[PDB]
Amino acid sequence: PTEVSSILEERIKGVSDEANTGRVLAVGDGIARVFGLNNIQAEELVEFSSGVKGMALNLEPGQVGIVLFGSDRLVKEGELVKRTGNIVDVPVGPGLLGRVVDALGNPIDGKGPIDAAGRSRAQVKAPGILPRRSVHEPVQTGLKAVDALVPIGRGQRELIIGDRQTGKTAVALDTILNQKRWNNGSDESKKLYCVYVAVGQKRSTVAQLVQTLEQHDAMKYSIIVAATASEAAPLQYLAPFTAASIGEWFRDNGKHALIVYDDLSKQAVAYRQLSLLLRRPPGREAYPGDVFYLHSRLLERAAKLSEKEGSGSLTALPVIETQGGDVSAYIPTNVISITDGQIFLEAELFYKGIRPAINVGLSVSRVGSAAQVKALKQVAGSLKLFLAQYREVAAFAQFGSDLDASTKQTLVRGERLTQLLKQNQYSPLATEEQVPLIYAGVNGHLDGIELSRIGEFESSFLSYLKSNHNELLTEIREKGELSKELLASLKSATESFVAT
Amino acid sequence: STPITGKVTAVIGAIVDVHFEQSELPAILNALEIKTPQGKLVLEVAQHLGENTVRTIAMDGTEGLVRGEKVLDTGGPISVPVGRETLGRIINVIGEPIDERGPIKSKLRKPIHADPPSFAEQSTSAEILETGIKVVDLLAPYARGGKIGLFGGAGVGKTVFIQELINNIAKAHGGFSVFTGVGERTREGNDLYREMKETGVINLEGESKVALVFGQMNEPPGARARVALTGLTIAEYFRDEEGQDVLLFIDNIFRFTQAGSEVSALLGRIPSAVGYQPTLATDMGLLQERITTTKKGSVTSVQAVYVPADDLTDPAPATTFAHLDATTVLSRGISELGIYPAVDPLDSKSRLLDAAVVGQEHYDVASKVQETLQTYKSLQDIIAILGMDELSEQDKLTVERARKIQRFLSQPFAVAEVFTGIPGKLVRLKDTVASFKAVLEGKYDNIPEHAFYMVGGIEDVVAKAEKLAA
Amino acid sequence: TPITGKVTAVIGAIVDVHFEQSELPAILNALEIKTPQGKLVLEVAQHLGENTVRTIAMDGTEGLVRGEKVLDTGGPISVPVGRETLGRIINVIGEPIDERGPIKSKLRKPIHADPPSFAEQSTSAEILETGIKVVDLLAPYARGGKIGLFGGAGVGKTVFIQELINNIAKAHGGFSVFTGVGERTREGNDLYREMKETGVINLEGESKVALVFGQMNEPPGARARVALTGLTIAEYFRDEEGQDVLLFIDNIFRFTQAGSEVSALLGRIPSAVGYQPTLATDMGLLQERITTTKKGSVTSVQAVYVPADDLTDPAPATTFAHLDATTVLSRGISELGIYPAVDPLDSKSRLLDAAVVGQEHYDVASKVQETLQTYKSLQDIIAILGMDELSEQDKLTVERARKIQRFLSQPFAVAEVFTGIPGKLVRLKDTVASFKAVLEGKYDNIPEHAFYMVGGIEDVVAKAEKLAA
Amino acid sequence: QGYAAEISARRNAMDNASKNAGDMINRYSILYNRTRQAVITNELVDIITGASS
Ligand SMILES: Nc1ncnc2c1ncn2[C@@H]1O[C@H](COP(=O)(O)OP(=O)(O)NP(=O)(O)O)[C@@H](O)[C@H]1O
Ligand SMILES: Nc1ncnc2c1ncn2[C@@H]1O[C@H](COP(=O)(O)OP(=O)(O)NP(=O)(O)O)[C@@H](O)[C@H]1O
Ligand SMILES: Nc1ncnc2c1ncn2[C@@H]1O[C@H](COP(=O)(O)OP(=O)(O)NP(=O)(O)O)[C@@H](O)[C@H]1O
Ligand SMILES: [Mg+2]
Ligand SMILES: [Mg+2]
């Protein structure tokens, strides 16, 4: 508007007016050894004369050891290095919503300057024993298998683990997409803001992803934080911490965020890289000694605050990639015991058509029913145990010796239950869509219906329930609890339809 | 005031080197203090590197530390307040309160490192501590004054189990109790403190029966590596100076070994096998041997033991076995059957299972139950391959009885109501033995398998049998 | 004036150079030592402190003498870019090695350059039909995407890639950049014969492709680099001349293997399996550059080698996450004589989605996989008990899966000197129908052998009539 | 006749099962020793590297 270039030149006129340390000893491989910087803090930020920033990690007697945030072609021996006087820290506040930032919280989307309500540090003490509460709110994913079997709670940490290409990211994504149900509303305390941390992913893959978030109008309530494949090891290692703070803002301020760490296996790969190069002696599989401490302190930062503290939650879905199904390898083991349960995805399951390829056998939520919706809870009574008994009888089936009316019975139901939990990507379901499905399966109204046809049952059922008994669907939703008469209406309603 | 000063010369992660004037070094295991913007930062001297320099370990986060910063010698090991003043309070590794209820007003403090009682101070007793939990009291009964480990890989039910214990034992117990949270979930601790208040065990405006010592996984190795001794010292004090009965709850003792692991290399030690520190054996020894009944008074301890990767032969747990009077082994295989608690009835052991301690009948029932299940285990090959069909008649019955028995070993815990929605049932030790005796002689062969699952005593087997047949 | 250093140390591929005064060559810069031969190139890896740098040689260090004069060239390794390099065979150091004189380009670019930014990213979901049944059907490749062939030794990554060059590269129009990293010089000599014959390379005409070769005889510096040279060339064709570039790398493994070869001598503590501690980010810098951007599409096929046939080795494990379609070669499958020896169950693509391939192709796929996965689940019972112990439904699935399995094999024209049968190219619509029919059991009555090593469903009915005589 | 024909079949079948599981045992035995062996080397390396530093 009326020469916009003249307004930028007048505001950036007088700035350099009060700017009157160590020298570099050697530089190589993201590391710079540096003589001087006597007043420097452990973990303090430093600017190199060349521009590139770095972090002090080894304050030794003669010298300081610095990991760089950049490339190093630009750093030479003897080049002057400078104290910032600050520990690594990030912008926070709801200004981040919708933005794609790097590890230090710089826009990388193209949408211009972040507006922040303030700045947190990257490392922050987790809330103590003292200011917390029981996890009692659901974080509804809209994933049949998950919301009936391993129900996740506002405040809980829940591992997503499996091999490569199993659908780990997909579970996390489908969860985010779902929150639309509540985020387009006005009840701030039912809302769930998402933070998606991309660690070691290729850029286009973060792209391909923000596109999908937008294709689903899901970006207005998310914040992606990206430390892609090419960035410095230090940024990769840092991202989850910086991110944890971005969403700690929400928790501290009465709201609920959701942090997806995709994925810690890489953060540890990178944290291994700082250390081996800083020359700290290695632990098992060349990892550093406290690679556990690394994750433990991050994941503890997820919590559900007490009323005195604003009731804000932060919920964590870390991801972990295994090899050859081995969960007994170092890192998975570490995180497995840090979190409040896991969802195991399996390749074998996948290829035979269970998608999400959740492994019920091994997946748990340790909060359990405390975070399930009452209605879902009511009709999911015993499903998870039953599904176990089902694998039991199906293993004994391999003997191919004649079945009786008891085993054939539970086989028919387990097969149909299995099938009823299959779900297409990108389609999270409302609770009231889930509930009648589960009820139809559990109380055995599905048991006389062809297996290939259960596909069509699902949508045809829901279509009819919306059309006719919408008054139920809207009660389930509003009330979240199937009263005795509502069980009746639903009972009637299902039978009705099963006779076509 | 005669204060000793040093300066920080290095920081590498959790390791902070400090330099002092001529031959005037604080000894190993001494605490040092650094006065920081928010609170203080405690160090612990680990080595004397020479040239008037010591290697320390930090009881906190080392970021923000500046080389050349003044360090102060406290003159002795980390101190904790002790006695009845710690009752109803929550304490961190460095004997400071974290409940925001003001300062712990005790007359004495005590060093957290101390020597383990001499061979001649030991006290052997075969006394039996009734848990209420059917499988323990039948098969591997816990010993009053004993030490008692709970082995289990991740999420097989250790913490729940240990809480079920506290729910029962810690009421009927006349004396005091310490609970130590070593590297667990801040929120688990949260629950306990809110349960203690509501069980009544704690009372912030009156009398309390338990001290709380916390050092969860949200905290750096040095801290996670000493808070066991912090807790353990408080216990020690009631044992030796209140001359009385204590119950020492540690969850989870494996994190004492792990934390030891995380700084080992930074202190410059070559790794031993499975990348554990060279000092695993003796370090565990040096702690465990203090947790002990002696002539002045009795401790009884329940320590959860994390079994990494479900591998029992992992150097860490494998070492711990030698330290315990009674071993409760939780198993994923068991828990996966819906059988809670996840106790392995065969691999669980307790020294007290000896006729001399529990009587012959108890010992015979307990042995037969074991033979039963061992057979049933041995036959699971022939059951898979040739069905249940291809069996001797005695066998067919042994299996019938083994299955009925497997279930009667599960039991709804009170603590775990959130999981079963089933009310907590507690069973008396005599009721345990009688019902298993009955089951074993066939005086119950007609009742269906489900009637034994997730119920209390044989009353409940009959009650359920009929309620279901209805 | 010239900046000259002195050779202080030689250890394998590493040379240490001391520089007299203040101005130390930047990290990544080229250095030159004059030989009786021509000259030796060096790449400044790190500043050791005290006016000494440590370099990696781009060639052999035989005959180097301590104290030697070393010339600083004041820039990264340079390579001729643009249309001038088409049909020329190039170095790691961007030189002509096709005995055909100077590559007279306008510009020389550094091999080292930062990967395209996040704002500069650009995605799309367009299929690229290949004529290969297993791929076409199961893990569809994407135009302007990143494809990778995984496999151990002699499973056929090279021959597979030559089938892709065969189909796509002919009817592509735009520019190709083939890069031989750590492969056989025989193969590279063969590929130069192969092009002059199809006319892709026309010594007297125009040319559609470019050749860059740091082969398996090269020192680890050469091989740690030659792919970056290839890339720079492609990146020009993409960003400057806004072109569709086909970019074949073979073998990209050989870049990370070279990284480890030098790494200890660079003074680094090793990492798991004895790899350079930087293995992930050194790959991220290189892989993140091979990409489509808002300025030009790049489709790239890369050959991935798999050490010791272990897929979880840290080199390939880390690769995967950089690709858009991943297609794996099983040794076992080749020992069945099934070619291409793809793993129908391990191969993946982002493009197998109903929104892209459509409900039917989507479903013909899944159902094929369920069938194969079931066969796989039973591999044990059949191994001990054999077929007679399977039920009826199971029994069928196996006979069907064994047919689907043989049908996934396809004669390749390039591999003709190994089958004998002249190679076939099936189409996408062709493949889906064909498989759907089999999955509707419309061919159950045909001997399993008919499905082996033939084209589309028509060829099955042919061979079965031939054999039923 | 049917039973005595079946018993013959059961015998012959079970017989081949023993031959196969026999041959399988052989394979896995070889695989076992490999894994054992490497477990020793990879475990050892972890120490050597920890030790040089
Ligand atoms: N419910 C589903 N139905 C069909 N396909 C799915 C489903 N969930 C995931 N997938 C697909 O499987 C492919 C890989 O899934 P993805 O969600 O990336 O798992 P992942 O463990 O994150 N793989 P990666 O992280 O790249 O190693 C994607 O192409 C998805 O389309
Ligand atoms: N008695 C029980 N009844 C029902 N479920 C149980 C019982 N004990 C444990 N569980 C289930 O197992 C889960 C883990 O229990 P928990 O005691 O936290 O395992 P854990 O071994 O202590 N975890 P960790 O401390 O990391 O080793 C819970 O969320 C419960 O669902
Ligand atoms: N599609 C195919 N048809 C027929 N034979 C094939 C095919 N693919 C591989 N082979 C055979 O397997 C051999 C190795 O194939 P090749 O393309 O050299 O594989 P490679 O895995 O790239 N080997 P290498 O490059 O040394 O690690 C060839 O000699 C072919 O005979
Ligand atoms: Mg993923
Ligand atoms: Mg626990």
PDB file of C-alpha atoms in Angstrom, chain C residues 103-256:
ATOM      1  CA  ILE C 103      33.208 -30.599 -21.908  1.00  0.00           C
ATOM      2  CA  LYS C 104      32.757 -27.030 -23.027  1.00  0.00           C
ATOM      3  CA  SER C 105      29.891 -25.938 -20.763  1.00  0.00           C
ATOM      4  CA  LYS C 106      29.116 -22.377 -19.677  1.00  0.00           C
ATOM      5  CA  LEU C 107      29.016 -22.964 -15.911  1.00  0.00           C
ATOM      6  CA  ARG C 108      30.786 -25.148 -13.389  1.00  0.00           C
ATOM      7  CA  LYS C 109      28.870 -25.890 -10.226  1.00  0.00           C
ATOM      8  CA  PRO C 110      29.957 -27.158  -6.772  1.00  0.00           C
ATOM      9  CA  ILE C 111      28.936 -30.773  -6.030  1.00  0.00           C
ATOM     10  CA  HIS C 112      28.014 -29.646  -2.532  1.00  0.00           C
ATOM     11  CA  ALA C 113      24.835 -27.607  -2.227  1.00  0.00           C
ATOM     12  CA  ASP C 114      22.017 -27.455   0.299  1.00  0.00           C
ATOM     13  CA  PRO C 115      18.886 -29.590  -0.202  1.00  0.00           C
ATOM     14  CA  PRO C 116      15.716 -27.836  -1.536  1.00  0.00           C
ATOM     15  CA  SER C 117      13.878 -26.019   1.276  1.00  0.00           C
ATOM     16  CA  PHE C 118      10.503 -26.902   2.756  1.00  0.00           C
ATOM     17  CA  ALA C 119       8.610 -24.048   1.100  1.00  0.00           C
ATOM     18  CA  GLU C 120      10.159 -25.314  -2.205  1.00  0.00           C
ATOM     19  CA  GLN C 121       8.575 -28.762  -1.817  1.00  0.00           C
ATOM     20  CA  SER C 122       6.065 -30.118  -4.276  1.00  0.00           C
ATOM     21  CA  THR C 123       3.893 -33.215  -4.189  1.00  0.00           C
ATOM     22  CA  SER C 124       1.469 -34.975  -6.461  1.00  0.00           C
ATOM     23  CA  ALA C 125       0.158 -38.464  -6.925  1.00  0.00           C
ATOM     24  CA  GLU C 126       0.660 -39.494 -10.543  1.00  0.00           C
ATOM     25  CA  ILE C 127       1.157 -43.156 -11.461  1.00  0.00           C
ATOM     26  CA  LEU C 128       4.008 -44.122 -13.754  1.00  0.00           C
ATOM     27  CA  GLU C 129       3.068 -47.341 -15.532  1.00  0.00           C
ATOM     28  CA  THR C 130       6.165 -49.580 -15.852  1.00  0.00           C
ATOM     29  CA  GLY C 131       4.851 -52.632 -17.675  1.00  0.00           C
ATOM     30  CA  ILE C 132       6.089 -54.702 -14.750  1.00  0.00           C
ATOM     31  CA  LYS C 133       3.232 -56.751 -13.220  1.00  0.00           C
ATOM     32  CA  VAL C 134       4.476 -56.921  -9.613  1.00  0.00           C
ATOM     33  CA  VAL C 135       5.065 -53.166  -9.549  1.00  0.00           C
ATOM     34  CA  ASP C 136       2.171 -51.963 -11.726  1.00  0.00           C
ATOM     35  CA  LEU C 137      -0.182 -54.067  -9.576  1.00  0.00           C
ATOM     36  CA  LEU C 138       1.265 -54.093  -6.044  1.00  0.00           C
ATOM     37  CA  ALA C 139       3.525 -51.107  -5.410  1.00  0.00           C
ATOM     38  CA  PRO C 140       2.888 -48.558  -8.175  1.00  0.00           C
ATOM     39  CA  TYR C 141       5.801 -46.191  -8.953  1.00  0.00           C
ATOM     40  CA  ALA C 142       5.031 -42.457  -9.103  1.00  0.00           C
ATOM     41  CA  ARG C 143       6.056 -39.868 -11.706  1.00  0.00           C
ATOM     42  CA  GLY C 144       8.627 -37.493 -10.179  1.00  0.00           C
ATOM     43  CA  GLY C 145       8.899 -39.757  -7.122  1.00  0.00           C
ATOM     44  CA  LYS C 146      11.732 -41.615  -5.427  1.00  0.00           C
ATOM     45  CA  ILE C 147      11.959 -45.283  -6.275  1.00  0.00           C
ATOM     46  CA  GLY C 148      14.428 -47.732  -4.744  1.00  0.00           C
ATOM     47  CA  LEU C 149      15.379 -51.347  -5.493  1.00  0.00           C
ATOM     48  CA  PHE C 150      16.520 -53.294  -2.465  1.00  0.00           C
ATOM     49  CA  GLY C 151      18.414 -56.496  -2.653  1.00  0.00           C
ATOM     50  CA  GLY C 152      21.470 -58.528  -1.797  1.00  0.00           C
ATOM     51  CA  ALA C 153      24.095 -59.761  -4.191  1.00  0.00           C
ATOM     52  CA  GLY C 154      23.014 -61.133  -7.465  1.00  0.00           C
ATOM     53  CA  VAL C 155      19.273 -60.939  -6.931  1.00  0.00           C
ATOM     54  CA  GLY C 156      18.990 -58.546  -9.774  1.00  0.00           C
ATOM     55  CA  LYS C 157      18.874 -54.892  -8.957  1.00  0.00           C
ATOM     56  CA  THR C 158      21.003 -53.988 -11.943  1.00  0.00           C
ATOM     57  CA  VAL C 159      19.004 -56.105 -14.451  1.00  0.00           C
ATOM     58  CA  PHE C 160      15.722 -54.815 -12.983  1.00  0.00           C
ATOM     59  CA  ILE C 161      16.902 -51.182 -13.441  1.00  0.00           C
ATOM     60  CA  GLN C 162      17.861 -51.924 -17.027  1.00  0.00           C
ATOM     61  CA  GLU C 163      14.258 -53.046 -17.602  1.00  0.00           C
ATOM     62  CA  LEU C 164      13.045 -49.724 -16.233  1.00  0.00           C
ATOM     63  CA  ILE C 165      15.519 -47.767 -18.376  1.00  0.00           C
ATOM     64  CA  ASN C 166      14.247 -49.998 -21.219  1.00  0.00           C
ATOM     65  CA  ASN C 167      10.583 -48.991 -20.939  1.00  0.00           C
ATOM     66  CA  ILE C 168      10.392 -45.528 -19.381  1.00  0.00           C
ATOM     67  CA  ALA C 169      13.610 -43.937 -20.748  1.00  0.00           C
ATOM     68  CA  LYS C 170      12.806 -44.606 -24.441  1.00  0.00           C
ATOM     69  CA  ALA C 171       9.355 -42.969 -24.472  1.00  0.00           C
ATOM     70  CA  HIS C 172      10.281 -40.207 -21.985  1.00  0.00           C
ATOM     71  CA  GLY C 173      11.569 -37.416 -24.230  1.00  0.00           C
ATOM     72  CA  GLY C 174      13.299 -35.440 -21.446  1.00  0.00           C
ATOM     73  CA  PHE C 175      16.780 -35.791 -19.952  1.00  0.00           C
ATOM     74  CA  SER C 176      18.381 -38.730 -18.126  1.00  0.00           C
ATOM     75  CA  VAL C 177      21.371 -38.820 -15.767  1.00  0.00           C
ATOM     76  CA  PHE C 178      22.778 -42.288 -15.134  1.00  0.00           C
ATOM     77  CA  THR C 179      25.257 -42.576 -12.217  1.00  0.00           C
ATOM     78  CA  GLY C 180      27.452 -45.670 -11.669  1.00  0.00           C
ATOM     79  CA  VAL C 181      28.560 -45.654  -8.047  1.00  0.00           C
ATOM     80  CA  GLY C 182      30.639 -48.598  -6.847  1.00  0.00           C
ATOM     81  CA  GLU C 183      29.574 -51.052  -9.560  1.00  0.00           C
ATOM     82  CA  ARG C 184      31.452 -53.020 -12.221  1.00  0.00           C
ATOM     83  CA  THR C 185      33.319 -51.121 -14.897  1.00  0.00           C
ATOM     84  CA  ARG C 186      32.258 -53.950 -17.238  1.00  0.00           C
ATOM     85  CA  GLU C 187      28.635 -52.884 -16.531  1.00  0.00           C
ATOM     86  CA  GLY C 188      29.497 -49.218 -17.229  1.00  0.00           C
ATOM     87  CA  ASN C 189      31.342 -50.147 -20.424  1.00  0.00           C
ATOM     88  CA  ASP C 190      28.280 -52.212 -21.359  1.00  0.00           C
ATOM     89  CA  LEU C 191      25.885 -49.366 -20.684  1.00  0.00           C
ATOM     90  CA  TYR C 192      27.936 -47.063 -22.941  1.00  0.00           C
ATOM     91  CA  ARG C 193      27.688 -49.704 -25.691  1.00  0.00           C
ATOM     92  CA  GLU C 194      23.980 -50.163 -25.003  1.00  0.00           C
ATOM     93  CA  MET C 195      23.137 -46.445 -25.474  1.00  0.00           C
ATOM     94  CA  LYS C 196      25.065 -45.817 -28.691  1.00  0.00           C
ATOM     95  CA  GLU C 197      23.056 -48.714 -30.076  1.00  0.00           C
ATOM     96  CA  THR C 198      19.520 -47.663 -29.077  1.00  0.00           C
ATOM     97  CA  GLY C 199      20.586 -44.143 -30.087  1.00  0.00           C
ATOM     98  CA  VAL C 200      19.996 -42.564 -26.661  1.00  0.00           C
ATOM     99  CA  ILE C 201      23.607 -41.537 -27.000  1.00  0.00           C
ATOM    100  CA  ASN C 202      24.474 -40.308 -30.474  1.00  0.00           C
ATOM    101  CA  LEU C 203      28.110 -39.284 -30.713  1.00  0.00           C
ATOM    102  CA  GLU C 204      27.291 -37.478 -33.967  1.00  0.00           C
ATOM    103  CA  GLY C 205      23.717 -36.557 -33.038  1.00  0.00           C
ATOM    104  CA  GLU C 206      21.946 -35.156 -29.988  1.00  0.00           C
ATOM    105  CA  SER C 207      21.685 -37.133 -26.743  1.00  0.00           C
ATOM    106  CA  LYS C 208      19.077 -37.737 -24.022  1.00  0.00           C
ATOM    107  CA  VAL C 209      21.303 -39.155 -21.253  1.00  0.00           C
ATOM    108  CA  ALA C 210      24.538 -38.332 -19.324  1.00  0.00           C
ATOM    109  CA  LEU C 211      27.061 -40.651 -17.785  1.00  0.00           C
ATOM    110  CA  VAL C 212      28.871 -40.243 -14.440  1.00  0.00           C
ATOM    111  CA  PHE C 213      30.991 -43.125 -13.072  1.00  0.00           C
ATOM    112  CA  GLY C 214      32.818 -43.635  -9.760  1.00  0.00           C
ATOM    113  CA  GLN C 215      33.077 -47.414 -10.018  1.00  0.00           C
ATOM    114  CA  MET C 216      34.078 -50.106  -7.506  1.00  0.00           C
ATOM    115  CA  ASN C 217      37.789 -49.867  -8.344  1.00  0.00           C
ATOM    116  CA  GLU C 218      37.894 -46.263  -7.082  1.00  0.00           C
ATOM    117  CA  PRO C 219      39.320 -45.158  -3.716  1.00  0.00           C
ATOM    118  CA  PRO C 220      36.754 -44.408  -1.004  1.00  0.00           C
ATOM    119  CA  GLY C 221      36.927 -40.624  -1.470  1.00  0.00           C
ATOM    120  CA  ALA C 222      36.027 -40.932  -5.161  1.00  0.00           C
ATOM    121  CA  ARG C 223      33.152 -43.280  -4.319  1.00  0.00           C
ATOM    122  CA  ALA C 224      32.107 -41.128  -1.340  1.00  0.00           C
ATOM    123  CA  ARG C 225      31.450 -38.349  -3.805  1.00  0.00           C
ATOM    124  CA  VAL C 226      30.689 -39.411  -7.405  1.00  0.00           C
ATOM    125  CA  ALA C 227      26.939 -39.478  -6.691  1.00  0.00           C
ATOM    126  CA  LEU C 228      26.975 -35.809  -5.629  1.00  0.00           C
ATOM    127  CA  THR C 229      28.440 -35.068  -9.098  1.00  0.00           C
ATOM    128  CA  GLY C 230      25.621 -36.949 -10.795  1.00  0.00           C
ATOM    129  CA  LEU C 231      23.125 -35.046  -8.612  1.00  0.00           C
ATOM    130  CA  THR C 232      24.491 -31.563  -9.333  1.00  0.00           C
ATOM    131  CA  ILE C 233      24.067 -32.328 -13.061  1.00  0.00           C
ATOM    132  CA  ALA C 234      20.443 -33.503 -12.607  1.00  0.00           C
ATOM    133  CA  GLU C 235      19.699 -30.554 -10.282  1.00  0.00           C
ATOM    134  CA  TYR C 236      20.692 -28.218 -13.102  1.00  0.00           C
ATOM    135  CA  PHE C 237      18.375 -29.908 -15.570  1.00  0.00           C
ATOM    136  CA  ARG C 238      15.616 -29.649 -12.993  1.00  0.00           C
ATOM    137  CA  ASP C 239      15.956 -26.132 -11.622  1.00  0.00           C
ATOM    138  CA  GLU C 240      17.589 -24.134 -14.389  1.00  0.00           C
ATOM    139  CA  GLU C 241      16.247 -25.783 -17.525  1.00  0.00           C
ATOM    140  CA  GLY C 242      12.926 -26.815 -15.858  1.00  0.00           C
ATOM    141  CA  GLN C 243      12.977 -30.395 -17.173  1.00  0.00           C
ATOM    142  CA  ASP C 244      11.612 -33.836 -16.426  1.00  0.00           C
ATOM    143  CA  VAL C 245      14.687 -35.726 -15.399  1.00  0.00           C
ATOM    144  CA  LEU C 246      15.016 -39.485 -15.096  1.00  0.00           C
ATOM    145  CA  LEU C 247      17.845 -40.133 -12.595  1.00  0.00           C
ATOM    146  CA  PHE C 248      19.196 -43.670 -12.190  1.00  0.00           C
ATOM    147  CA  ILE C 249      21.694 -44.324  -9.350  1.00  0.00           C
ATOM    148  CA  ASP C 250      23.380 -47.738  -9.085  1.00  0.00           C
ATOM    149  CA  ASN C 251      24.425 -48.419  -6.475  1.00  0.00           C
ATOM    150  CA  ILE C 252      23.604 -45.876  -3.763  1.00  0.00           C
ATOM    151  CA  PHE C 253      24.706 -48.237  -1.055  1.00  0.00           C
ATOM    152  CA  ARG C 254      28.292 -47.828  -2.226  1.00  0.00           C
ATOM    153  CA  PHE C 255      28.253 -44.196  -1.051  1.00  0.00           C
ATOM    154  CA  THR C 256      27.618 -45.094   2.642  1.00  0.00           C
TER     155      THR C 256
END
